[PDB]
Design a binder for this molecule. Structure first.
Ligand SMILES: CC(C)Oc1cccc(/C=C2\SC(=O)NC2=O)c1N1CCC[C@@H](N)C1
Length: 273
């Protein structure tokens, strides 16, 4: 069963997402993460191509599953009487972006550009697979320290991507857009761009731009750190109050600040050495 196949290690973290343990797949010693999600805390349920009733998180993970290293890979899953157990990949050595920024402070723009570009490629992969993450933030990004490769994780607040309005949200409030705060309505892509603006500001300033609902609604962006004019322009564009004024993923990737990105290996050599 699950217990024989995996050697359970220390608790890595717990919160809204459930409880996550470090682990090792007994067969080939592969490092894994073991995520426990309780059934009574699962609001969104879905169906696999075979028809089994599983949490939406499992449906979304299977849709994004591929060799592309920018998004976490679900290795296996198990149903228990009161919970679901997810076996996910675990890079080693690794650090999440929240811990990285906490430890190092505001990131050099060259590093932020490499990290932000990789997040953009990971989000485009989710969207191409028909998945909306809905919780893009530093805590949901892993840094593979040896490779300089980032991984988007935690599809627990996600949904199938649609072109109609979303009226439900259970991601991070401080990353949520002003249309959600004011109207309890948002469209997938433009809400994702807002959260990307919050994330980019967080990378280059070392903290998020808004704390309160009033601040999000006003959308006045103040730079507390020295940030280049092109980077400030890109951030302010992603953080446009009107969702239709926000750039598309293509416009973000074609922005002058996004040019000449380092390769992940060059990023590891210069900044993660
Ligand atoms: C030890 C490294 C830094 O952390 C991890 C490595 C591999 C997986 C996970 C977690 C995953 S994967 C997924 O889809 N959902 C998850 O909850 C993980 N987390 C531990 C709890 C805190 C979190 N921010 C990072």
């Amino acid at each position: 069963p699950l217990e024989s196949q995996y050697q359970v290690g220390p608790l890595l973290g717990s919160g809204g997402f459930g409880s996550v343990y470090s682990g090792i797949r007994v067969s080939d010693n592969l490092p894994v993460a073991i995520k426990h999600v309780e059934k009574d805390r699962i609001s969104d349920w879905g169906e696999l191509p075979n028809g089994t009733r599983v949490p939406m998180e499992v449906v979304l993970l299977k849709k994004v599953s591929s060799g592309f290293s920018g998004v976490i890979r679900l290795l296996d899953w198990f149903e228990r009487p009161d919970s679901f157990v997810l076996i996910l990949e675990r890079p080693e050595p690794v650090q999440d972006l929240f811990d990285f920024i906490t430890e190092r402070g505001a990131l050099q723009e060259e590093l932020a550009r490499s990290f932000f570009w990789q997040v953009l490629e990971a989000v485009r992969h989710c969207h191409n697979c028909g998945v909306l993450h809905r919780d893009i933030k530093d805590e949901n990004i892993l840094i593979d320290l040896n490779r300089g490769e980032l991984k988007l994780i935690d599809f627990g607040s996600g949904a199938l991507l649609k072109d109609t309005v979303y009226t439900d949200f259970d991601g991070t409030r401080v990353y949520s857009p002003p249309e959600w705060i004011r109207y309890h309505r948002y469209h997938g892509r433009s809400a994702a761009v807002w959260s990307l603006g919050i994330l980019l500001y967080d990378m280059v300033c070392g903290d998020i731009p808004f704390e309160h609902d009033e601040e999000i609604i006003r959308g006045q962006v103040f730079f507390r750190q020295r940030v280049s004019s092109e980077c400030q322009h890109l951030i302010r564009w992603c953080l446009a109050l009107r969702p239709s004024d926000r750039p598309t993923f293509e416009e973000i990737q074609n922005h002058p600040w996004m040019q000449d990105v380092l390769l992940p290996q060059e990023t590891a050599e210069i900044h993660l050495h």
